[PDB]
Symmetry: C3
């Protein structure tokens, strides 16, 4: 058997919401210490890696590793059936016939049970994560979402430029151009609004605006967002969960 209970069903919906767009199908590997999942879009420029620890649940029981894959559209449509305050339980037994989703409310009444059919996918798992990245920065997700949403209307490509103590987001298209310059600072009212930055080597990268808009969806999961950049590898966008995280690996556009 396999039982995983989210305290609030909102968490699982938001997590799948990061998966909802920019990818069709996903493979969830469950084991004794939690669940992990990798998914790559059709153009293979974006990889989404999810890890959810035991502490993110209120109840977790896995007597046996278990791999279950499912269509995100089919899964998202079934994740439109519960209150965001409901308790959500996932059920599977050994060889997975199919996955069971179970909703429950505060008033011990109105029990909804669902069954999503499972699929067969290729286990080509990627460990492209790097030891050291050329530059690293963190900032409020709301601020970063604004920056991307603003510049997206100008062009299909967004450029990120980092120098010493300076972060510069630049977009340039048909109707014109725009730029947002932010600098590291520590705000003591709430140390959350702080912008942090560590630079080993200056970086200059360009990303497809289409894919960045898909990445910023993780703002519903965390107050802050982590960005690890390097001119040698895809960028790493990370959203922290309670004892877990959701990662977005995006390959820069290149070259002249």
């Amino acid at each position: 058997m396999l039982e995983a209970k989210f305290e609030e069903a909102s968490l699982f919906k938001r997590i799948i919401d990061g998966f909802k767009d920019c990818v069709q199908l996903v493979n969830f590997q469950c084991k004794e210490d939690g669940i992990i999942a990798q998914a790559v879009d059709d153009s293979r420029v974006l990889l989404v890696s999810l890890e959810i620890g035991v502490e993110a649940f209120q109840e977790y029981r896995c007597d046996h590793p278990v791999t279950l894959g499912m269509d995100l559209t089919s899964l998202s449509k079934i994740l439109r059936c519960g209150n965001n305050t409901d308790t959500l339980t996932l059920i599977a037994d050994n060889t997975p016939d199919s996955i069971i989703l179970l909703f429950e409310d505060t008033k011990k009444d109105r029990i909804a049970e669902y069954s999503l059919k499972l699929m067969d996918i290729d286990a080509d798992f990627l460990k492209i994560e790097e030891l050291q990245y050329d530059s690293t920065l963190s900032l409020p997700s709301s601020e970063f979402s604004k920056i991307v949403r603003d510049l997206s209307q100008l062009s299909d490509s967004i450029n990120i430029m980092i120098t010493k103590e300076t972060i510069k987001f630049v977009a340039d298209g048909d109707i014109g151009s725009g730029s947002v310059i932010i600098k590291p600072f520590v705000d003591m009212e709430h140390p959350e609004t702080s912008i942090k930055l560590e630079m080993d080597q200056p970086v200059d990268l360009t990303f497809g605006a289409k894919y960045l808009l898909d990445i910023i969806k993780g703002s519903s999961l965390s107050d802050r967002v982590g960005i690890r950049l390097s001119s040698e590898a895809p960028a790493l966008f990370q959203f922290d969960l309670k004892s877990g995280f959701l990662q977005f690996f995006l390959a820069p556009k290149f070259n002249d």
Copy 2:
């Protein structure tokens, strides 16, 4: 002459809102003791029966029976002209040239007058209502709306199953299946949230999901919804008004 004044225009809009979809044209018969109306959709699987007593109005005057029919789209577009707190007056004189709608506000000012042209329809009135139904249940409209809206995403058909002290809503489609089981209970905080059920004979019926979504619109008219079921006749969905009601007769899908 004929004068019928709704205290709040919201009531008439919501009543027509139950008519807005799942039917094109409607025939309103007015007389000394109120108004009644029947309408059947194109496929003749759904019949909508409305009855509005004198007490639902604040003022009603009818010196003569009078039948007036009108296009719901044309009527709904004209019901988008007033505040939901306005006083609405319907005016007609003997042989109906056309119907007059009159809006009025708290501040005795801003008087809006409208004139909707009338049509000729066939008076084939149906009295298919049954003496005794095999089973009867009532429950909060909000709860019932959730159950239908949830299961609708799974398939085009929804199955309702009733056994002794047990009500089971089941849907089964391509992407998977789902089920909601509710049981009778009396909640004394508000006796409104109570689920009631009386069974003479167990029933198992299947309905087109398209039509149920049209029926649940009556939730804006009442706190509770009444469902009378039988394996021999169309189901009866009833929403109570202040001294009136709105009914939905739906024929089950059948058979193997």
Copy 3:
């Protein structure tokens, strides 16, 4: 150089919002005493005239007249980048290479800079404004917006009729007809809700409903709206700003 700073960026967005529809391109002439702009739609039945005084800004500096034209769509898309509480600064230097837009927040941080390319337009400026109009009236913008939005669903033409101490809005179409009659009154709670009217000669005009719906957009700029009517010339719809205004000249439909 040329620097014009709006206290709140919301003002400029709403002003362009009156321009957003019912016209494609606009020519902004800036000089020592403020900015003015004229724009005519494709069918040449509607002229939009804008005037913004120095006092509408918090800061204004113009060492030299300067004419700059720009696409409204391109401009509106770039006006979707700031909070409605931001400070907006427009920058240009002598012969305009292109216009610069600059956003700033309360927390002296997050500086966004943009550059919209400019165009070449024909300076055929119109002074069709009349000395004396046959009739003049003013009323709450919210009330006038309701009247237009209501009657618009009935037909493609709206008729305005003015007699002694009487204002009558009438629409007549396929599905039926409607009419709204308002009369002059002074309400002392707030003298804003007052309806004023001065008649030299009674007027009866008909306007394209398509264009009136575009005109009522100025409601986001002022509490009241001014309407100057005449059977000899296009109607004048005026929305007052803080030391400025936005005007709509609309030619009546004519004739039998």
